[PDB]
Amino acid sequence: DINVVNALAYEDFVKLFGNVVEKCPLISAAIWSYRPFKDLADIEARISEFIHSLPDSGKEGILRCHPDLAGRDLQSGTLTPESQEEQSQAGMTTLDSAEIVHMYRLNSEYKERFGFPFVICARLNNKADIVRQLSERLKNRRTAELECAIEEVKKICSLRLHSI
Amino acid sequence: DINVVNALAYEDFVKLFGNVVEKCPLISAAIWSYRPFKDLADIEARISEFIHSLPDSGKEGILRCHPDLAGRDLQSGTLTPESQEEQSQAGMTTLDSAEIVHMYRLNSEYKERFGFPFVICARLNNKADIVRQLSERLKNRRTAELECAIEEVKKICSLRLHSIV
């Protein structure tokens, strides 16, 4: 109900919406300045607009706040609740020993090339399509890749918003 | 040693500096793109330029990431390590019931007016200093107070950076 959302104290808005962009409560906190919102689509558009206003370093910064697929945080149970549910849904918590080693190698190569983690909308992908995209995007130019990765962040945000 | 800092992977850079601006690891993560840093002043400068580049809503957002002095998070024991240390130095952890309620009322007034929390560099202020600032800053226009509060965020950041050092 957008009416209840529109009446929220910023403290409660930030609590509810503070992880729609992974570990970036600043973004959701910022857009509360634009209330009242017409609907959830309005919130979505405002978030997208905010992200796009950032310098490229800000965009790379958002990416760097994300955990690796199947990496150290998954393995040690220190993912955010949303990342945990997304990674598990995409097959990341039932990978076999060879599958884990492979994801480590791919992630390593990606972060070395681009200087930020591999981000994908896990809810919209399975194991196989994730491996495929990791390899494909590895071939991209930095400028094109940053755009690709931020689009994934926006898809994740949209799904998280609609889960609240 | 600025050379050790300059050689950090982004994951380690974000782990170490991710809370120099409260609950805003994005800021530390962004500035890593501008490495190598000439010195600590270069890091601070880059942080300041980044914040300065945000829309006003981004600046308000940063402020909204900060917890209230003597507020729910202090009482519940859920502050970040740096905030817990800072609020303790400023006398916020040894308040009596009257004082805790007084702080709640002052914060409620400020946040109602401005639409973000009252932020002050707690390491440079005592309990009485805080109450005085809480009352004087309440008089400010919103345009001016946002600028004032962001200046305090940068002071907090500077001290957080110096404590890592």
Cα angle A77-B64-B85, degrees, rounded to a multiple of 5: 65
CA distances from B27 to A113, B14, B59, B121 (A): 22, 9, 12, 18
Q: Output helix, strand, coil percentages for chain B, rounded to the nearest 5.
A: 70, 0, 30
CA distances from B38 to A150, B20, B155 (A): 30, 19, 20
Please state, in angstroms and rounded to a whole number, the distance separating the CA atoms of residues B83 and B52: 23
Tell me how crowded residue A25 is: count the other CB atoms within 10 A of its CB: 22
Tell me how crowded residue B11 is: count the other CB atoms within 10 A of its CB: 18
Q: How far is B95 from chain A (nearest CA, A)?
A: 23
| Burial status of residue B38 (CB atoms within 10 A of its CB: 0-12, 13-18, 19 or more) | exposed
The torsion of the CA quartet B34, B37, B38, B41, rounded to 10 degrees, works out to 100
Using the structure block, give the residue that is written with the tokens 């001016």. Answer: B144
And the tokens for A86? 């997304």
Coil vs helix vs strand at B155: helix
| Burial status of residue B76 (CB atoms within 10 A of its CB: 0-12, 13-18, 19 or more) | exposed
Tell me how crowded residue A52 is: count the other CB atoms within 10 A of its CB: 11
Give the residue from B102, B137, B139 showing the smallest Cα distance to B121: B137
Please state, in angstroms and rounded to a whole number, the distance separating the CA atoms of residues A13 and A10: 5
Tell me how crowded residue A7 is: count the other CB atoms within 10 A of its CB: 12
Residues of B in contact with A26 (CB under 8 A): 23-24, 26, 58, 61-62, 64-65
Cβ(B118)–Cβ(B110) below 8 Å: yes
Q: How was this structure determined?
A: X-ray
To one decimal, the resolution in angstroms is 1.8
Nearest to A57 among B33, B64, B116 (CB): B33
Please state, in angstroms and rounded to a whole number, the distance separating the CA atoms of residues B25 and A159: 22
Q: What is the 3-state secondary structure (H, E, C) of A12-62?
A: HHHHHHCCCCCCCHHHHHHHHHHCCCCCHHHHHHHHHHHHHHCCHHHHHHH
Using the structure block, give the residue that is written with the tokens 């240390």. Answer: B85
Please state, in angstroms and rounded to a whole number, the distance separating the CA atoms of residues B48 and A77: 34
Domains in chain B: ranges and CATH: 1-165 (1.10.3330.10)
> A64: nearest CA in chain B?
B29
| Burial status of residue B57 (CB atoms within 10 A of its CB: 0-12, 13-18, 19 or more) | buried
Q: Check if B17 contacts A (Cβ < 8 Å).
A: no
Coil vs helix vs strand at B119: coil
Q: How far is A124 from chain B (nearest CA, A)?
A: 25
Q: Check if A26 contacts B (Cβ < 8 Å).
A: yes
And the tokens for B77? 């024991």
Please state, in angstroms and rounded to a whole number, the distance separating the CA atoms of residues A82 and A156: 10
List binding-site positions of B for substrate. Answer: 67, 83-87, 118-122
Catalytic residues of B, by residue number, are 66
Q: A57 and B115 in contact by Cβ < 8 A?
A: no
**Which residues in chain B (94-123) have CB-CB distances under 8 A to chain A?**
111, 115-116
